[PDB]
Chain A
């Protein structure tokens, strides 16, 4: 590998994967002083949840069984993205449809944050999460009310809803990050029927962020080196067939976005053509990545022994 891969890993220095784990205090102070989310309202669109935070939240949600559980999530912000670096449980007692956090959670919050600041946890609380055991991931009326209350005073705040029952029964995590609109502000204007069917009655009162996950380099190495079923599943992952339907849906809404961009460019100020081009480049890049994986597998397995 010599010079080629010597600086390509450089374990002495944090890689580009571990960049997000560094906390810049000055940048955080500058962004919270500027308050760019006050002018717009659909500002934050992405929620990046760390692997450990997602694992802890999922395990807490499942530990409650059929009873609701809740906790807080630490993190920061960067541009239009809300990054969640950790999560921590609350000592609350709830029923299958109601969790209150009466008097032991509020002392635990402050005491746990004070304890965490002692051992080098520079992040502050960024959100609150609770579980919906068996009725989807959505914001109820009181959930919307408390989200408004948290957002109006503690400005950066995202509500995460988990569903342990569907997570277990489907094999994939069911999670959703949401943000709400101010009281009596922004009433913007087959869709409504399904929208009220899967969301609550307050469909227009809150919006859903796009949830993505990340992990560090050490986490990636430990995970891929944990079991033998992780490199076997990489050499036979077979993309372009596991998620072909997602690709077709992306092409469809790409076509809709291209039509909108064509309509806009013929004559609020968003430059839709650039976003459509970015989406097209992204989906084409996933397609080419899948083809590269197939080519590598063919060269590795088929082209051996005549």
Chain B
């Protein structure tokens, strides 16, 4: 609820502009927020909306688009590298800190649903952390893991008023 209150605040600022062009940081926030909501079509159209002159002026905008290109191809092992290729200032940094978590949870849901057996090499590149999940996942979440072959096995875990509305409509 609190997050939604900030979402609609940035929406209208771009529409009203003294000359049809808003300040650079407003443009960057909308593009990054589109990535967080997985709305890829509007994110692509926003990039096409920015004039070329301002686009080349600020390379910070280009850093958002390079990450957006990877997530547009659903390249899970590649988005984690582009999100760290550039350095984002603290004004836009917290938004990226939430997009990374959203991508991380998205891979977890996709693997558990679309895969019955997945190589540990490929699964680590999906979830994003090939650091400490190798040993922690065996005993905590209960997923049986087999070494050498490296196969992971995901496992699955008031009306009365409505009715009288129907009759009052049908009989009349």
Which A residues have a C-beta under 8 Å from some C-beta of B?
281, 284-285, 288-289, 291-292, 295-296, 299
Q: How far is the CB of B30 from chain A (nearest CB, A)?
A: 48
Q: How far is the CB of B82 from chain A (nearest CB, A)?
A: 54
Q: How far is the CB of B109 from chain A (nearest CB, A)?
A: 34
Which single residue of chain B is at the shortest CB-CB distance from A280? B170
With a cutoff of 8 Å between Cβ atoms, the chain A residues found around residue B159 in the complex are: 295
Q: Which 5 A-B pairs have the closest CB atoms?
A: A281-B170, A292-B163, A288-B167, A285-B167, A295-B159
Question: B170 touching A292 by the CB < 8 A rule?
Answer: no
Q: Indicate whether B164 reaches chain A with its CB closer than 8 angstroms.
A: yes
21 A-B residue pairs with Cβ-Cβ distance under 8 Å, sorted by A, are: A281-B170, A281-B171, A284-B166, A284-B170, A285-B167, A285-B170, A285-B171, A288-B163, A288-B166, A288-B167, A288-B170, A289-B167, A291-B163, A292-B160, A292-B163, A292-B164, A295-B159, A295-B160, A295-B163, A296-B160, A299-B160
A299 CA to B161 CA, complexed, in Å: 13
Residue tally, chain B, CB below 8 Å to A: 8
With a cutoff of 8 Å between Cβ atoms, the chain A residues found around residue B164 in the complex are: 292
With a cutoff of 8 Å between Cβ atoms, the chain B residues found around residue A292 in the complex are: 160, 163-164
Which single residue of chain B is at the shortest CB-CB distance from A299? B160
A291 CA to B164 CA, complexed, in Å: 11
With a cutoff of 8 Å between Cβ atoms, the chain B residues found around residue A281 in the complex are: 170-171
With a cutoff of 8 Å between Cβ atoms, the chain B residues found around residue A288 in the complex are: 163, 166-167, 170
* Binary interface encoding of chain B residues 138-172 relative to chain A, with 1 for a CB under 8 A from any of its CBs, else 0: 00000000000000000000011001101100110
Which single residue of chain A is at the shortest CB-CB distance from B170? A281
With a cutoff of 8 Å between Cβ atoms, the chain A residues found around residue B163 in the complex are: 288, 291-292, 295
Which single residue of chain B is at the shortest CB-CB distance from A289? B167
A292 CA to B159 CA, complexed, in Å: 9
A233 CA to B78 CA, complexed, in Å: 68
Q: How far is the CB of B165 from chain A (nearest CB, A)?
A: 10
A296 CA to B160 CA, complexed, in Å: 8
Q: How far is the CB of B167 from chain A (nearest CB, A)?
A: 5
With a cutoff of 8 Å between Cβ atoms, the chain B residues found around residue A299 in the complex are: 160
A299 CA to B158 CA, complexed, in Å: 10
Q: How far is the CB of A55 from chain B (nearest CB, A)?
A: 31
A296 CA to B161 CA, complexed, in Å: 12
A281 CA to B167 CA, complexed, in Å: 8
Q: How far is the CB of A143 from chain B (nearest CB, A)?
A: 39
A292 CA to B160 CA, complexed, in Å: 7
